Design a protein around this ligand. Sequence first.
Ligand code: APR
Length: 252
Amino acid sequence: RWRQTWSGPGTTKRFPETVLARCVKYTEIHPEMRHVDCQSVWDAFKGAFISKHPCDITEEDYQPLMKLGTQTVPCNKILLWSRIKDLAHQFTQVQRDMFTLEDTLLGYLADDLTWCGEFDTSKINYQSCPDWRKDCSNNPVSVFWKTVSRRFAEAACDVVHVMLDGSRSKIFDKDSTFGSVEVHNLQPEKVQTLEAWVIHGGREDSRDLCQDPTIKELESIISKRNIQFSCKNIYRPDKFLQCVKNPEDSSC
Ligand SMILES: Nc1ncnc2c1ncn2[C@@H]1O[C@H](COP(=O)(O)OP(=O)(O)OC[C@H]2O[C@H](O)[C@H](O)[C@@H]2O)[C@H](O)[C@H]1O
């Protein structure tokens, strides 16, 4: 229509088919997640938001999905990221040791998709979904990501890495998912160091972005959780990926 109920994009075309297909592929690739029934997962996921008002979703709504999507990941190999999506995933596509949330079953199913239902009916709304800013915070997509991102951060131990976009303006932004949920769910009992990799834009010869005021902020915040802080510039992200793909050979 010309009006729409909400300000955000509607459910992604082919959402149900896409989620199911992502689950078959994932559980096919990963030997640990081979016990999972992808139809059961879909039913659990749909159950969280179908016939529910899309401004009144809770983390409780996603409990059935979280249960079915339970996955042990090596706690010391987690890669968090903020606003530098492409390079973070290119990295874990080549360095199969480190994992982002989108490399877990639940993150993989949901990545880049939008979904919402209706309080009015049992249908999926393909026309519009609540915008976190203009409409309401407690919507199906926002609540999903808050819940899974908290649980992922809680799982981390030892040295946790985070890729940050050095071209942003707030390189560390306290209002990002990284800054507002994940930083505040790293467990002091478990996490030894948070190490940031600050990815430079282009150009070439830049400042040491590890001295940026927002990085000092992040450093002092995580200090309260009794977590040590490390920071590295990645001045040349292209050479960096090349080095990840071809380890050894002196250039790297
Ligand atoms: N739509 C989403 N909303 C909130 N968090 C998300 C979303 N998609 C992924 N995440 C989580 O955010 C992480 C990426 O961290 P930041 O870049 O720190 O997150 P941010 O930039 O705040 O993303 C919020 C999201 O809402 C807006 O619609 C925007 O388009 C972006 O997709 C994790 O990989 C994932 O845990």
